[PDB]
Write a protein that binds this ligand. Structure first.
Ligand code: STE
Length: 131
């Protein structure tokens, strides 16, 4: 887990609109989100990880242990059952609600953090650089 820790800033985004549309996010929220560049902070205290996502529009914070389910309320106000695991060196976050699922996968490639978001047929790639 240790290579993920730190402060990251968004530098590139592809197909986030498609992703948000698939989740049912309304057009006005999609407008603002398309212009927002969040900062993600990942910290550890023992076995507990904390993931903070900060922006001018909305802020979220979750704390969790790897491999243990937790309740999460997402930025778009879904109430989901989540689990985060390490798989092939990737941090894989699975959210389940109402029989649906979405995955948020983070991988480090060339020192950058690549976040891939999948729901239905929509696939979004967001690139973060370390601050
Ligand atoms: C918390 C602020 C991050 C982006 C805010 C705008 C988006 C809110 C509506 C869509 C939310 C979809 C789930 C969260 C996607 C996370 C993206 C990211 O960490 O880069």
């Amino acid at each position: 887990v240790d290579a993920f820790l730190g402060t990251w800033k968004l530098v590139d985004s592809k197909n986030f609109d498609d992703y948000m549309k698939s989740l049912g996010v309304g057009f006005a929220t999609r407008q603002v989100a398309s212009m927002t560049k969040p900062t993600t902070i990942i910290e550890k205290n023992g076995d507990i990880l904390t993931l903070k996502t900060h922006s001018t529009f909305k802020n979220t914070e979750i704390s969790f242990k790897l491999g243990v389910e937790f309740d999460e309320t997402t930025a778009d106000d879904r109430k989901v059952k989540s689990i985060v695991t390490l798989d092939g060196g990737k941090l894989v976050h699975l959210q389940k609600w109402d029989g649906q699922e979405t995955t948020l996968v983070r991988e480090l490639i060339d020192g950058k953090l690549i976040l891939t978001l999948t729901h239905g047929t929509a696939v979004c790639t967001r690139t973060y650089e370390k601050e």
